Write an enzyme that holds these catalytic residues in place. Sequence first.
Site, PDB file in Angstrom:
ATOM      1  CG  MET B 168      -1.475  -0.574   5.598  1.00 24.47           C
ATOM      2  SD  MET B 168       0.093  -1.289   5.549  1.00 24.47           S
ATOM      3  CE  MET B 168       0.687  -0.996   7.314  1.00 24.47           C
ATOM      4  CG  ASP B 171       4.821   2.022   5.655  1.00 26.77           C
ATOM      5  OD1 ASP B 171       5.603   2.199   6.898  1.00 26.77           O
ATOM      6  OD2 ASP B 171       4.994   1.508   4.562  1.00 26.77           O
ATOM      7  CG  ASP B 220      -6.701  -3.190  -1.086  1.00 23.94           C
ATOM      8  OD1 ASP B 220      -7.277  -3.928  -0.510  1.00 23.94           O
ATOM      9  OD2 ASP B 220      -5.703  -2.299  -0.754  1.00 23.94           O
ATOM     10  CE  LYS B 254       4.809   2.393   1.332  1.00 18.83           C
ATOM     11  NZ  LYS B 254       3.593   2.040   2.236  1.00 18.83           N
ATOM     12  CG  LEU B 257       5.228  -8.577  -4.633  1.00 22.72           C
ATOM     13  CD1 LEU B 257       6.261  -8.148  -5.610  1.00 22.72           C
ATOM     14  CD2 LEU B 257       4.376  -9.400  -5.205  1.00 22.72           C
ATOM     15  CG  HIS B 258       5.834  -6.939   2.645  1.00 24.42           C
ATOM     16  ND1 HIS B 258       6.214  -6.373   3.950  1.00 24.42           N
ATOM     17  CD2 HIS B 258       4.592  -6.508   2.306  1.00 24.42           C
ATOM     18  CE1 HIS B 258       5.080  -5.523   4.225  1.00 24.42           C
ATOM     19  NE2 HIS B 258       4.270  -5.665   3.522  1.00 24.42           N
ATOM     20  CG  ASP B 308       4.628  -7.298  11.429  1.00 26.60           C
ATOM     21  OD1 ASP B 308       3.568  -7.243  10.539  1.00 26.60           O
ATOM     22  OD2 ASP B 308       4.644  -6.249  12.313  1.00 26.60           O
TER      23      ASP B 308
HETATM   24  N1  LIG Z   1      -6.437 -10.639  -2.907  1.00 27.19           N
HETATM   25  C1  LIG Z   1      -6.102  -9.132  -2.849  1.00 27.19           C
HETATM   26  N2  LIG Z   1      -6.415  -8.306  -3.724  1.00 27.19           N
HETATM   27  C2  LIG Z   1      -6.254  -7.140  -3.669  1.00 27.19           C
HETATM   28  N3  LIG Z   1      -5.827  -6.318  -2.394  1.00 27.19           N
HETATM   29  C3  LIG Z   1      -5.322  -7.120  -1.481  1.00 27.19           C
HETATM   30  C4  LIG Z   1      -5.567  -8.562  -1.776  1.00 27.19           C
HETATM   31  N4  LIG Z   1      -5.260  -9.412  -0.331  1.00 27.19           N
HETATM   32  C5  LIG Z   1      -4.600  -8.280   0.441  1.00 27.19           C
HETATM   33  N5  LIG Z   1      -4.865  -6.942  -0.317  1.00 27.19           N
HETATM   34  C6  LIG Z   1      -4.323  -5.695   0.168  1.00 27.19           C
HETATM   35  O1  LIG Z   1      -3.133  -5.401   0.221  1.00 27.19           O
HETATM   36  C7  LIG Z   1      -2.701  -4.374   1.088  1.00 27.19           C
HETATM   37  C8  LIG Z   1      -1.631  -4.946   1.909  1.00 27.19           C
HETATM   38  S1  LIG Z   1      -1.209  -3.422   2.858  1.00 27.19           S
HETATM   39  C9  LIG Z   1      -0.330  -2.263   1.716  1.00 27.19           C
HETATM   40  C10 LIG Z   1      -1.238  -1.012   1.554  1.00 27.19           C
HETATM   41  C11 LIG Z   1      -0.633  -0.002   0.623  1.00 27.19           C
HETATM   42  N6  LIG Z   1      -0.208  -0.371  -0.746  1.00 27.19           N
HETATM   43  C12 LIG Z   1       0.576   0.715   1.286  1.00 27.19           C
HETATM   44  O2  LIG Z   1       1.672   0.511   1.043  1.00 27.19           O
HETATM   45  O3  LIG Z   1       0.268   1.591   2.130  1.00 27.19           O
HETATM   46  C13 LIG Z   1      -4.074  -4.281   1.791  1.00 27.19           C
HETATM   47  O4  LIG Z   1      -4.586  -2.766   1.600  1.00 27.19           O
HETATM   48  C14 LIG Z   1      -4.720  -5.291   1.541  1.00 27.19           C
HETATM   49  O5  LIG Z   1      -6.367  -5.209   1.627  1.00 27.19           O
HETATM   50  O1  LIG Z   2       3.742   1.870   8.841  1.00 28.56           O
HETATM   51  C1  LIG Z   2       3.503   0.601   9.457  1.00 28.56           C
HETATM   52  C2  LIG Z   2       4.602  -0.453   9.276  1.00 28.56           C
HETATM   53  C3  LIG Z   2       4.514  -1.462   9.590  1.00 28.56           C
HETATM   54  C4  LIG Z   2       3.182  -1.979   9.914  1.00 28.56           C
HETATM   55  C5  LIG Z   2       3.039  -3.818  10.317  1.00 28.56           C
HETATM   56  C6  LIG Z   2       2.033  -4.456   9.974  1.00 28.56           C
HETATM   57  N1  LIG Z   2       1.902  -5.718  10.782  1.00 28.56           N
HETATM   58  C7  LIG Z   2       0.252  -6.037  10.451  1.00 28.56           C
HETATM   59  C8  LIG Z   2       0.418  -6.548   9.011  1.00 28.56           C
HETATM   60  C9  LIG Z   2       0.965  -5.620   8.014  1.00 28.56           C
HETATM   61  C10 LIG Z   2       0.899  -6.133   6.774  1.00 28.56           C
HETATM   62  C11 LIG Z   2       1.688  -5.058   5.842  1.00 28.56           C
HETATM   63  O2  LIG Z   2       1.319  -5.380   4.364  1.00 28.56           O
HETATM   64  C12 LIG Z   2       2.491  -4.084   6.210  1.00 28.56           C
HETATM   65  O3  LIG Z   2       3.014  -3.162   5.068  1.00 28.56           O
HETATM   66  C13 LIG Z   2       2.419  -3.813   7.346  1.00 28.56           C
HETATM   67  C14 LIG Z   2       1.951  -4.605   8.291  1.00 28.56           C
HETATM   68  C15 LIG Z   2       2.259  -1.421  10.140  1.00 28.56           C
HETATM   69  C16 LIG Z   2       2.239   0.145   9.818  1.00 28.56           C
HETATM   70  O4  LIG Z   2       1.491   1.017   9.926  1.00 28.56           O
END
Ligand SMILES: Nc1ncnc2c1ncn2[C@@H]1O[C@H](CSCC[C@H](N)C(=O)O)[C@@H](O)[C@H]1O
Ligand SMILES: Oc1ccc(C[C@@H]2NCCc3cc(O)c(O)cc32)cc1O
Lengths: 352, 352
Positions: B168, B171, B220, B254, B257-258, B308
């Site tokens: 992440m 990403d 988080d 970021k 929501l997906h 995914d």
């Molecule tokens: N109930 C909750 N409260 C706060 N964060 C949460 C949550 N459930 C999941 N998350 C967090 O949502 C994130 C989704 S992954 C996206 C991580 C970061 N915003 C990025 O774009 O790189 C994870 O770090 C996960 O720990």
């Molecule tokens: O740069 C990335 C792009 C996509 C992924 C897929 C990943 N699959 C497990 C669950 C999950 C959950 C997420 O919120 C997300 O943004 C990515 C993924 C991982 C990454 O490290």
Amino acid sequence: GAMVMINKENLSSQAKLWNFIYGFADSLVLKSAVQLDLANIIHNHGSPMTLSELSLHLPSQPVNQDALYRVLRYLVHMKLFTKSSIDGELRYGLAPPAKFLVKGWDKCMLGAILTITDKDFMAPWHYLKEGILNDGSTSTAFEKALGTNIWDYMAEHPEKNQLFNEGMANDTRLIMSALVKECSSMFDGITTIVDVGGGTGTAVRNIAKAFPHIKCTVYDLPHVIADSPGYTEINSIQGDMFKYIPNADAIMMKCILHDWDDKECIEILKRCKDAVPRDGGKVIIIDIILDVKSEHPYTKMRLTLDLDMMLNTGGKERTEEEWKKLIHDAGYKGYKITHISAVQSVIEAYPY
Amino acid sequence: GAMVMINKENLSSQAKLWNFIYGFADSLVLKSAVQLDLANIIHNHGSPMTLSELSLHLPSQPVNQDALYRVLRYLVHMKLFTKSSIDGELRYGLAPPAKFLVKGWDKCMLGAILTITDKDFMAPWHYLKEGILNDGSTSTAFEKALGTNIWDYMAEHPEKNQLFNEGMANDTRLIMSALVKECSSMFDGITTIVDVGGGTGTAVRNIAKAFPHIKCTVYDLPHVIADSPGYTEINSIQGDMFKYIPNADAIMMKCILHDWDDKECIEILKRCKDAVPRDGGKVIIIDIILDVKSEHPYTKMRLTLDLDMMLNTGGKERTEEEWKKLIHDAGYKGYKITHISAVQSVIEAYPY
Ligand SMILES: Nc1ncnc2c1ncn2[C@@H]1O[C@H](CSCC[C@H](N)C(=O)O)[C@@H](O)[C@H]1O
Ligand SMILES: Oc1ccc(C[C@@H]2NCCc3cc(O)c(O)cc32)cc1O
Ligand SMILES: Nc1ncnc2c1ncn2[C@@H]1O[C@H](CSCC[C@H](N)C(=O)O)[C@@H](O)[C@H]1O
Ligand SMILES: Oc1ccc(C[C@@H]2NCCc3cc(O)c(O)cc32)cc1O
Ligand SMILES: [K+]
Ligand SMILES: [K+]
Ligand SMILES: [K+]
Ligand SMILES: [K+]
Ligand SMILES: [K+]
């Protein structure tokens, strides 16, 4: 110092990497389409079907139609399936490559798909780094992932043995028509043929049907013969090809030599050379020929099979030059290649 | 009866299927190239290297050079690496897309590759059929494969938590430059911003550097904040976004929501709307917008992320129309999309 980017980076280049990273999604979506039997439900229906109609025909109930819609959306983007508006409804059909997912003909590829995309059978590919940095282990990636060498593993896992043997059955179904038709002259004058490592007998059953006057034999390890249907007019023999090859006018080996390193191949080829007659005997090798100078439709999957061998069997796929050297070193007089528009080609190897 | 083929079948069509069957080989060869660090050994050397020279620089000794040659042959066919004869020797270099495998810049994609191609993290994709024919289970494929839901799994598996959080991080590194430069005006007048589900803090550390007068907060779950470096000027808060979102001039989410179905998204979006001021408050959503009418470089991987999500989180990727409905249902006044030439787009959602 280092490169500094100052203008927009190429999106296509980055997309190429993302598509490689997620290559497994194509394998495993396709696996799901096969397990759901989507292509056959549609083909049997004979026209495109709505999401609801497809759902009513799936292998089990109930059906999560949101999930089905989203897998279909991915399959349509693969250009395996189609989606269109017809008389006010969205209907799903087959694109031309989906014909290989339709049952009932020699080029149905379903057995191969289910073998190659099996979770356990994919595990060795996770040990590819350890095939280069082997920390002084000599084991195959298959042994690292699943515990022992492939053939002993099959002997101790009957369901896996069956799944693999049916994949091989499928692989052989793909080429038999071209083989017996285009290469009919190879069978002239032969009264007996033994298919060494012939699996569950697809190749011999097809040769025996096309050539009723040839006495055919299938020869493989005991656990493979045990997974074969009974035979009437075809001899089924079990044993070890490194110690014995049944003598006959001709020997065929399909997808055998690519399992083995050069020393092993020469041992097998010598055993075959001495099993056939000096007078018109021949050894019929069916395996990939790798072209490392130009590109062909099957080039990518042939290079893939090279690493598949490296990880699963300890073998390799060979170029013509490599085949020439091996056949020379086993003491044969010459060889002839016949292309059959398949993944494998035919290499006839001729003794003195 | 059925279709009878009478002339040669199309080789390209069959090759397309074989290439889909073996899609995982691209993912797992690429993984091996990353683990061997081939692109960085070559890039640091500054010119193409022989097989022997590469071998001398690999992560460990000894090296099986046959295996290395054969993996390189596959990588050259991928057009990630190059091979040429130079001053009498065969030398391996980098093709243009290999720049994303080179360390030291924001578009290095190595963290993402190692997350997505991890064996355990690939396991859910083997349960895709069970996501459609769910036998009346409501669990995600991630739970079926690995035992529990993704976020609790991360809380109980520290090394997996770290590997995912760094994916992440990666990403987010891919988009920060475009975000803070192209979308600088979004940060005007803001005195405080909270990155909800902000992971290990990449997004906030970059915003805080670009905009020194904004007080940034990362928020988080506890096990993610526990895997984060300490902060001086940036607030780090742990908690559950379904019960509390820290109030600020702006909220950013970021890749949040997906992860969630529509009911959950509306709950999160309502909590965000009430956390920002009626007077110029805004919620900055960074996620995919799926185009289901035309094709773009990232279309294929965006549809891949849809499945995914379906398998790993219970979420989905959304079209503009789906985003519009969700943002409407959460009671916002309007939204504005900004494209940033990335996988995700920016969707600003504006309350009354
Ligand atoms: N109930 C909750 N409260 C706060 N964060 C949460 C949550 N459930 C999941 N998350 C967090 O949502 C994130 C989704 S992954 C996206 C991580 C970061 N915003 C990025 O774009 O790189 C994870 O770090 C996960 O720990
Ligand atoms: O740069 C990335 C792009 C996509 C992924 C897929 C990943 N699959 C497990 C669950 C999950 C959950 C997420 O919120 C997300 O943004 C990515 C993924 C991982 C990454 O490290
Ligand atoms: N020592 C040995 N003796 C005989 N058969 C062997 C063997 N080692 C492996 N085999 C067999 O060689 C086959 C390789 S797979 C190819 C199967 C079949 N010829 C086809 O093309 O469809 C397997 O069936 C395996 O059981
Ligand atoms: O049609 C097929 C093509 C390729 C394969 C790959 C397979 N990997 C495991 C080991 C192995 C060994 C073989 O001798 C062979 O011909 C194929 C395979 C399976 C098939 O069912
Ligand atoms: K796997
Ligand atoms: K078994
Ligand atoms: K080739
Ligand atoms: K762990
Ligand atoms: K798109």
